[PDB]
Amino acid sequence: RMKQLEDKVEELLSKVYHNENEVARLKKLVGE
Amino acid sequence: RMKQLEDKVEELLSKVYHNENEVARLKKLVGE
Amino acid sequence: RMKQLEDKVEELLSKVYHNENEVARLKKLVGE
Ligand SMILES: [Cl-]
Ligand SMILES: [Cl-]
Ligand SMILES: [Cl-]
Ligand SMILES: [Cl-]
């Protein structure tokens, strides 16, 4: 379970960062 | 702590996916 | 590895919530 967990956190890290970047751009495009 | 961790990753998975979906729609609505 | 994992989930919790809040506002600003 520890390796399952670490693999999944590694994946979540990436998706969260991606979402941060997309939100940053959207904020710019809307002026927020 | 292992069960706490897994429960929390399970919850984070869901929220991240939800955020991905909402961002996808917003990108469409703004044209991004 | 357990402490590394918990520290990282704690950080991901925060970033996910932040992203939720930003998405909520954007949805309002676009009308989504
Ligand atoms: Cl990171
Ligand atoms: Cl997220
Ligand atoms: Cl998933
Ligand atoms: Cl939380």
Curated annotation (Swiss-Prot), chains A, B, C:
It is found in: Nucleus. Disruption phenotype: Abolishes recruitment of the mediator complex to the upstream activating sequence (UAS) of amino-acid starvation responsive genes. Decreases RNA level of genes involved in amino acid biosynthesis and cofactor biosynthesis during amino acid starvation or methyl methanesulfonate stress. Growth dependent on amino acid supplementation. Sensitive to amino acid starvation. Sensitive to purine starvation. Decreases cellular glycogen levels during glucose starvation. Residues 5-26 are annotated as: Leucine-zipper. Induction: Translation is induced by amino acid or purine starvation, or during growth in low or poor carbon sources. Translational repression during nutrient-rich conditions is dependent on four uORFs (upstream open reading frames) present in the 5'-UTR of the mRNA; these promote ribosome dissociation. Translational induction occurs in conditions reducing translation machinery efficiency, leading to ribosomes scanning over the uORFs, and increased translation of the mRNA. The rapid translational induction is followed by transcriptional induction at later time-points, independently of the uORF sequences. It comes from the Eukaryota. Phosphorylated by the cyclin-CDK PCL5-PHO85. Belongs to the bZIP family. GCN4 subfamily. Homodimer. Each subunit binds overlapping and non-identical half-sites that flank the central CG base-pair in the pseudo-palindromic motif 5'-ATGA[CG]TCAT-3'. Interacts with the mediator tail; the interaction with GAL11/MED15 is direct. Interacts with the SAGA histone acetyltransferase complex. Interacts with the SWI/SNF chromatin remodeling complex. Master transcriptional regulator that mediates the response to amino acid starvation. Binds variations of the DNA sequence 5'-ATGA[CG]TCAT-3' in canonical nucleosome-depleted 5'-positioned promoters, and also within coding sequences and 3' non-coding regions. During nutrient starvation (low or poor amino acid, carbon or purine sources), it activates genes required for amino acid biosynthesis and transport, autophagy, cofactor biosynthesis and transport, mitochondrial transport, and additional downstream transcription factors. Residues 89 to 100 and 106 to 125 define the N-terminal activation domain (NTAD) and the central acidic activation domain (CAAD) respectively, which can function independently to promote high-level transcription of the target genes. This is General control transcription factor GCN4. The gene is GCN4. The chain holds residues 249 to 280 of 281 of the full protein.
